[PDB]
Amino acid sequence: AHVLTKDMIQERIVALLESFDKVNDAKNITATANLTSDLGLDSLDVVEVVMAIEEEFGLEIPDHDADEIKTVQQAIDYVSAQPAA
């Protein structure tokens, strides 16, 4: 079959963020990064990247768990919490 690991979620979410353009720049990226402040997002293109990350992993997010993945690391372990890939 096809397994994911956490290396993969890492290099997919960062891949997703380097092709997004309204980020500040492509190398202040790491797992620790606030999307609010570090990458210079407004309150609604954090929502455009939540939509992009949920179509990216093929999964769907309710509104009360989309709001709280504000860091990249919370997003990575939240996407790793689900069995679907």
Binding site: L44, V47, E48, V50, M51, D63, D67
Partner: protein, 106 residues
């Protein structure tokens, strides 16, 4: 009904979630969809600088109605999730030893 806040942010972040997801299943094409997505992105960016509560609430409730009318019969769901087709196919049984009810017979 409220200016710049955490709760008004909560409300229209979820409304932008909803209209993006709702526009997702109308449009078959990719670039027609993303032309349309940048178009309503523009629609959200022409607003969000209103300081009134009167017409902030009036625009808020009618874009809620405008969101209500363009609703879709089938949402696109991934199948292993509660709208989908792979949902609860082989639920693994929980590990339970046998409780017994009779002194003489199993």
């Amino acid at each position: 009904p409220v200016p710049f806040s955490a709760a008004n942010k909560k409300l229209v972040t979820s409304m932008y979630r909803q209209s993006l997801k709702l526009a997702r299943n109308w449009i078959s094409n990719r670039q027609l969809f993303r032309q349309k997505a940048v178009e309503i992105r523009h629609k959200f960016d022409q607003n969000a600088q209103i300081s009134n509560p009167r017409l902030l609430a009036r625009t808020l409730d009618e874009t809620r109605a405008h969101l209500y009318e363009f609703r879709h019969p089938d949402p696109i769901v991934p199948p292993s999730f509660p709208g989908g087709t792979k949902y609860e196919r082989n639920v693994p049984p929980r590990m339970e030893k046998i409780m017994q009810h009779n002194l003489y017979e199993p």
